[PDB]
Amino acid sequence: YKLICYYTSWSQYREGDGSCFPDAIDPFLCTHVIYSFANISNNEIDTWEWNDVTLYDTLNTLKNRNPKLKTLLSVGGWNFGSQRFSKIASKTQSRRTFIKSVPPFLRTHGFDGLDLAWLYPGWRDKRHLTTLVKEMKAEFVREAQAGTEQLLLSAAVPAGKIAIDRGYDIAQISRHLDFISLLTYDFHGAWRQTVGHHSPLFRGQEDASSRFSNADYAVSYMLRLGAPANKLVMGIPTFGKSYTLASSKTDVGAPISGPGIPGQFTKEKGILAYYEICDFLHGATTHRFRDQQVPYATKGNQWVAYDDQESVKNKARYLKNRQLAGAMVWALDLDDFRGTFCGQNLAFPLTNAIKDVLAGV
């Protein structure tokens, strides 16, 4: 199985214990570590944070301890305008300038591949994403001729049917990618005007939940569109999503006034790291969605959908049963990477839980 794990460069800036440098990463934890995100500047791949050349070195030096570990650099992300990516991909000359820039930058910095994280292509973009994947792969096949192991090429693909349909020609892009990480953890958000889970495995029955907004639908759809199971990696979050309640109701369809209050460390309304969630659960009421197979918790006027050891283990069992290529984790710096918050004295509890199941029958 693959265990694809994202590291985010902006985690460095979180205060105190929240602060995450790549030497926090267990070199034998994941099969692949993906550093997020690279810029595109002057129509070439480029660094984003001021100290990225040092952080890339600190990540890549993990390979002296686990020579089999693979690293990738993810280009794009949500602070990169989809429109910016569209302009580069849609023109022959800019596309080529970008593609030619990628192997030398990855080699200089010690990366084994590129992850494409265009978030996300519009309807007019779908044909250009296809060309970009094809031509990037062709360039990596050519660069391999000079004697180094061929660069890997992956992509991060949203799991909502509507975004898949708009932006992605899954049958074609899957031919050229080494793996696709399916982003099966964005199925609910404050835009809705109720509580709900963002990473359910299956639909809620009871009495209100749409049939596409779950991981099983998205996996099945990707496979039906032509993505081979041996290229499909299912995303599992280590973060949870928070809401502010509009009433005393906390169950299904409970109204919300907006995102939850920021976490002490992550400092973003609507999202909490798992280490923050472990702390939140002190004094909280916990519940599970029985059909969806994922938990939530509530204290005061705050309501949190999250994943725990049990839920990620159950997701890992699913993807094994479906003969998928493995799991992706978003993100290492959102798991309890210190191992001190969740009462287990265990670094990376959720990632380790996943790995424990992938290393079983």
Ligand X SMILES: *[C@@H]1O[C@H](CO)[C@@H](O[C@@H]2O[C@H](CO)[C@@H](O)[C@H](O)[C@H]2NC(C)=O)[C@H](O)[C@H]1NC(C)=O
Known binding positions for chitin: 49-50, 76-79, 120, 183-186, 241, 330
b/e sequence 45-73, b meaning 16+ C-beta within 10 Å: bebbeeebeebbeebbebbeebeebbbbb
184 binds ligand X (CB under 6 A): no
Residues making up the binding site: 49-50, 76-79, 120, 183-186, 241, 330
In the complex with ligand X, the residue whose CB is nearer, 102 or 164, is 102
In the complex with ligand X, the residue whose CB is nearer, 6 or 48, is 48
We find the least distance from the C-beta atom of residue 90 to ligand X, in angstroms, to be: 15
We find the least distance from the C-beta atom of residue 135 to ligand X, in angstroms, to be: 21
Number of residues this chain uses to bind ligand X (CB under 6 A): 3
Contacts 24+ apart (CB under 8 A), 282-285: 285/250
Strand partners of residue 179? 154
If we measure between CA atoms, which residue out of 71, 11, 36 comes closest to residue 275? 11
Task: Please give the Cα distance from 281 to 299 (Å, whole number).
Answer: 8
In the complex with ligand X, the residue whose CB is nearer, 39 or 311, is 39
Contacts of 49 by beta carbon, 8 Å cutoff, 6+ apart: 9, 10, 12, 55
If we measure between CA atoms, which residue out of 320, 321, 329, 314 comes closest to residue 358? 320
In the complex with ligand X, the residue whose CB is nearer, 43 or 292, is 43
We find the least distance from the C-beta atom of residue 87 to ligand X, in angstroms, to be: 9
285 binds ligand X (CB under 6 A): no
Looking at residues 21 to 60 of the shown chain, list those that interact with ligand X (rule: CB under 6 A).
39, 41, 48
We find the least distance from the C-beta atom of residue 46 to ligand X, in angstroms, to be: 7
In the complex with ligand X, the residue whose CB is nearer, 80 or 168, is 80
Q: What is the DSSP string of 66-79?
A: -TT-EEEEEEEESS
In the complex with ligand X, the residue whose CB is nearer, 52 or 115, is 52
H or E stretch covering 235: strand 232-237
b/e sequence 7-22, b meaning 16+ C-beta within 10 Å: bbbebeebeeebebbb
We find the least distance from the C-beta atom of residue 49 to ligand X, in angstroms, to be: 7
> Cβ-closest residue to ligand X?
41
Which pair of tokens denotes residue 267?
């400092």
In the complex with ligand X, the residue whose CB is nearer, 41 or 148, is 41
- Where would I find the H helices in the chain? 52-60, 82-90, 92-109, 126-143, 161-167, 170-176, 215-224, 274-280, 309-321, 349-358
We find the least distance from the C-beta atom of residue 62 to ligand X, in angstroms, to be: 24
We find the least distance from the C-beta atom of residue 74 to ligand X, in angstroms, to be: 14
Looking at residues 76 to 115 of the shown chain, list those that interact with ligand X (rule: CB under 6 A).
none
Write the single-letter amino acid at 317.
R
Contacts with ligand X by CB under 6 A lie at: 39, 41, 48
